[PDB]
């Protein structure tokens, strides 16, 4: 099934997943002509993000990314419903081209991108249910640039060699997920878009923080070399690299900014 | 059949046109990391480009772009085969976001892009036969930016009002097509890629000139506003805008440059 390279790659997803050829698709390039300040974009509140170090949370290689399952007592507030967390995961490039963010800024890729997925729990029982309904999902995106070593991201990356292959699972002790977010979270871009992976449901309220975080070259190299899209016993192994979608046409959307300059 | 917007937009091209989901797809981002000087990239010569002003050439709005039909005695000298001209056309954005080149440079769109399409007339009888064959096509691409008024581009643009709607046609008196090319045409990027429109055949030798040309603000606005994709008697007219493909992944490959400096 679907991949980021070859016959089953992104230009072919719409063959099996119609919404991937529909409107309101993500990611997009964030550039001046389509930005507009909106003073009503007040600061989000991150509730229940400080996960207990004595509890443990499931990390899974699902064949397309590495994902950490999050508890439903973790929420974002500030939105017009409460949105409950369900999972976070990453997108990245490869060792010879560490430029695999999904969203771009003024045409430039960052090294990687973190997505923290939430669903409207006011309205829906689980994320799977919410995924194909209006205002079902809210995703927070953190842009990641090559920089200093990041001990908070390492709480995830230290477990990659235990989830190298599709289907494998590991437990990560709790930590404060807010440490994965950048400086000045009150500054963000906001827009209506989609899942960036099949089935590309146009049901996501996106928040992309303005400021990136840093992880080191060695942490990116671990992330880019540790994982496979395939099962441990697959005789045609495929490295999990370059797992980002190209940016999409705007189709008349604006992107709203909580910052005026 | 296909479009640049809505259900039949670029992510769905591969359903009817499988090569749109295959290898070697264009356009691409031209950035320093993938550039490599190649001394074999000598200057092309543009032969037969000074079209007799006693002859006339058909301008058509075909619902995807505006195209001028060119005579086969017009050709590129300097490639291994002679490539004969078939037609030129443009790609552009829209007045709210006037950055609709196909190729990008260091992640940045230019305002528009002109393509002069040629086919291998040494090997093949016409452009339609060549389009799906080895060594079949060669495209010259000129990046366009806003700046001073360009009389030569006005030799085309002054006729746009007569090809407002799909299916309409105007005659253009011969002028020197070389006037549409930028300064220092010896400076270019070269790579093997594809058509940027269905059927997306991977049979194009691209030459993208390093230096852009200029057209005025008013010229660019005319191109963006003069044309519709729809027939005149269509009860739901659509503006012809944003008629460019998003950039494609281009991994483990180089773009060769005729310049180092
Ligand atoms: C909502 C859910 C269906 C859980 C989802 C999954 C993915 C992956 C994990 C397949 C990458 C990617 C996304 S995305 N990149 O946030 O649109 C969302
Ligand atoms: C539809 C239109 C925009 C006019 C177009 C036509 C062609 C053909 C006819 C050579 C295939 C080629 C291209 S392109 N952008 O040079 O690959 C574009
Ligand atoms: Zn994601
Ligand atoms: Zn073209």
């Amino acid at each position: 099934k679907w991949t980021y390279f070859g016959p089953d790659g992104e230009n072919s997803w719409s063959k099996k997943y119609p919404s991937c050829g529909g409107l309101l698709q993500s990611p997009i390039d964030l550039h001046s002509d389509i930005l507009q300040y909106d003073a009503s974009l007040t600061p989000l509140e991150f509730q229940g993000y400080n996960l207990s170090a004595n509890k443990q949370f499931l990390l899974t290689n699902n064949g397309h990314s590495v994902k950490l399952n999050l508890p439903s007592d973790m929420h974002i507030q500030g939105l017009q419903s409460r949105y409950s967390a369900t999972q976070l995961h990453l997108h990245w490039g490869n060792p010879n081209d560490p430029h695999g963010s999904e969203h771009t800024v003024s045409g430039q890729h960052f090294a990687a991108e973190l997505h923290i997925v939430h669903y409207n729990s006011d309205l829906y029982p689980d994320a799977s249910t919410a995924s194909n309904k209006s205002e079902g999902l809210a995703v927070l995106a953190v842009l990641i640039e090559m920089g200093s070593f990041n001990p908070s991201y390492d709480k995830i990356f230290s477990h990659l060699q235990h989830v190298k292959y599709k289907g494998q699972e590991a437990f990560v002790p709790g930590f404060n997920i807010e440490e994965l977010l950048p400086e000045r979270t009150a500054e963000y871009y906001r827009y209506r878009g989609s899942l960036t992976t099949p089935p590309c449901n146009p049901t996501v309220l996106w928040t992309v923080f303005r400021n990136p975080v840093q992880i080191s070259q060695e942490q990116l190299l671990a992330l880019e070399t540790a994982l496979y899209c395939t099962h441990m016993d697959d005789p045609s192994p495929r490295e999990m690299i370059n797992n980002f979608r190209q940016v999409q046409k705007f189709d008349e959307r604006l992107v709203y900014t909580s910052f005026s300059q």
Side-chain angles (χ1 to χ4, degrees), chain A residues 123-132 136-226:
Chain A
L123 252 126
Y124 306 109
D126 56 284
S128 176
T129 296
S131 67
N132 59 347
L137 299 177
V139 180
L140 307 177
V142 183
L143 299 168
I144 298 171
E145 71 178 1
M146 189 182 289
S148 294
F149 180 81
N150 192 308
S152 307
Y153 281 80
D154 225 53
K155 291 167 176 166
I156 296 166
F157 301 152
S158 65
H159 297 270
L160 291 175
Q161 295 301 340
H162 237 340
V163 290
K164 295 183 63 68
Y165 306 105
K166 185 170 177 196
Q168 293 190 322
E169 291 181 359
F171 278 117
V172 173
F175 63 100
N176 179 11
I177 303 304
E178 214 174 332
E179 298 169 8
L180 298 182
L181 302 187
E183 291 200 296
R184 293 178 299 285
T185 50
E187 300 183 37
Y188 58 84
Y189 304 89
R190 166 67 54 76
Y191 80 94
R192 297 236 182 244
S194 73
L195 285 62
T196 67
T197 51
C200 304
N201 286 177
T203 57
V204 177
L205 194 58
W206 278 96
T207 304
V208 182
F209 297 105
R210 185 192 188 171
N211 300 305
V213 304
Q214 291 179 18
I215 72 180
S216 70
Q217 190 275 163
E218 295 80 2
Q219 294 179 286
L220 281 158
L221 185 69
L223 175 67
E224 294 154 352
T225 60

Side-chain angles (χ1 to χ4, degrees), chain A residues 4 65 87 89-91 102 113-115 117 139 196-197 206:
Chain A
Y4 293 90
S65 189
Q87 46 100 339
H89 60 266
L90 297 106
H91 301 269
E102 303 217 282
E113 189 169 328
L114 170 77
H115 289 158
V117 185
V139 180
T196 67
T197 51
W206 278 96

